[PDB]
Amino acid sequence: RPTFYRQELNKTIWEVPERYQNLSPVGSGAYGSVCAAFDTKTGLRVAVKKLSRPFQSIIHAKRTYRELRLLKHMKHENVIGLLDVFTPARSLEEFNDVYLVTHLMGADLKLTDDHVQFLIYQILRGLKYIHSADIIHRDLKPSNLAVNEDCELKILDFGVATRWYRAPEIMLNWMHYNQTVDIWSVGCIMAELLTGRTLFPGTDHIDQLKLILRLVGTPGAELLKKISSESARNYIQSLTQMPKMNFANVFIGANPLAVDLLEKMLVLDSDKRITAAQALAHAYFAQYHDPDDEPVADPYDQSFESRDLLIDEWKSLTYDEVISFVPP
Numbered sequence: 001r002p003t004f005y006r007q008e009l010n011k012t013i014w015e016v017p018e019r020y021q022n023l024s025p026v027g028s029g030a031y032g033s034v035c036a037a038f039d040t041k042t043g044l045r046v047a048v049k050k051l052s053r054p055f056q057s058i059i060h061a062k063r064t065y066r067e068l069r070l071l072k073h074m075k076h077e078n079v080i081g082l083l084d085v086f087t088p089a090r091s092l093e094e095f096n097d098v099y100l101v102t103h104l105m106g107a108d109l110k111l112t113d114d115h116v117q118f119l120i121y122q123i124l125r126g127l128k129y130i131h132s133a134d135i136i137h138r139d140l141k142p143s144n145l146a147v148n149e150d151c152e153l154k155i156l157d158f159g160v161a162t163r164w165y166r167a168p169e170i171m172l173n174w175m176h177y178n179q180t181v182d183i184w185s186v187g188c189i190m191a192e193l194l195t196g197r198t199l200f201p202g203t204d205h206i207d208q209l210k211l212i213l214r215l216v217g218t219p220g221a222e223l224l225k226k227i228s229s230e231s232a233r234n235y236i237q238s239l240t241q242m243p244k245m246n247f248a249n250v251f252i253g254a255n256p257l258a259v260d261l262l263e264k265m266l267v268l269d270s271d272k273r274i275t276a277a278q279a280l281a282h283a284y285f286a287q288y289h290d291p292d293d294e295p296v297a298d299p300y301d302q303s304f305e306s307r308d309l310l311i312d313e314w315k316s317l318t319y320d321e322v323i324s325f326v327p328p
């Protein structure tokens with residue numbers, strides 16, 4: 001048991017191991033507030049997140065468990081990993097707080113084409129990894145991507161409007177989806193880095209769809225066959241029909257290989273959209289691609305998602321995961 005010490009900052013008690021020094025508030029993360037700190041063990045800067053009321057209800061309790069399970073699993077250069085997890089509690093009975101420690105993430109995301117190449121390559125390399133364990137991000141956007149001064153990138157979640165980057169199949173719920181919802185988001189981010197402008201800045205779900213269809217065209221007879229929802233089918237067929245634009249005439253003067261890749265990412269049909277692994281092998285990435293250094297994840301059991309448990313049961317499962325943690 002390490003020695004803990006207490007303090008108050010921003011009208012909240014932080015009780016942390018002596019290992020972590022000089023805590024400094026940096027704002028809110030996903031379901032908690034965050035401080036920067038100094039890790040005396042390595043001499044590096046770290047981010048410490050104290051979760052907000054982790055066990056107040058069933059939903060909070062299961063989302064606390066979800067995040068801890070996920071962070072303990074993800075071990076890859078372009079994805080956030082877990083340095084430490086702790087509680088000041090000495091027993092399950094008095095267990096009420098959870099703190100998660102990671103490396104101190106940098107600032108978030110016109111750029112040079114060489115820069116666009118390296119940043120999109122790193123995002124796809126991280127996505128090949130998470131997708132290989134059937135983990136889907138679902139909220140990829142520039143503010144959820146950390147980049148240091150070396151231009152190294154990690155995918156994370158800090159909890160730009162989300163609707164601007166959302167795949168139509170999960171925003172409107174109109175056909176089956178797969179991991180490629182994240183690929184649509186990547187296409188939207190890449191366009192923005194090439195142009196300096198948000199590609200589809202919609203005001204609501206309806207405006208958003210209107211802006212999308214202006215570029216990709218109204219679904220034809222072949223895609224309409226896969227639209228599960230009758231409401232959505234009627235909607236689509238009632239619009240004034242829009243043709244597909246030539247992307248080359250939209251992204252004027254971009255690298256033609258970039259324009260080709262964008263054409264393969266920004267398709268409405270989820271069965272036809274390029275996957276992360278396929279996109280790594282596209283000619284655009286010739287300078288960076290190495291099929292021997294693009295690893296997959298160990299399998300991830302998420303059978304817990306389908307379970308219906310009491311607050312104290314999620315709490316005991318979370319306690320177990322704190323106890324069983326082993327440092328990298």
Ligand SMILES: Cc1ccc(NC(=O)c2ccnc(N3CCOCC3)c2)cc1-n1cnc2ccc(N3CCN(C)CC3)cc2c1=O
Nearest residue numbers: 026027028029034047048049080100102105137155156157
């Ligand atoms: C410490 C910590 C602990 C946990 C997490 N959790 C996740 O990143 C996360 C949660 C759920 N799913 C994730 N996946 C990523 C991979 O694809 C699948 C989904 C990631 C994040 C942090 N963290 C790290 N550094 C920060 C630096 C500054 C800041 N702040 C606050 C926000 N403002 C905007 C900038 C400075 C916050 C953090 C912050 O939260």
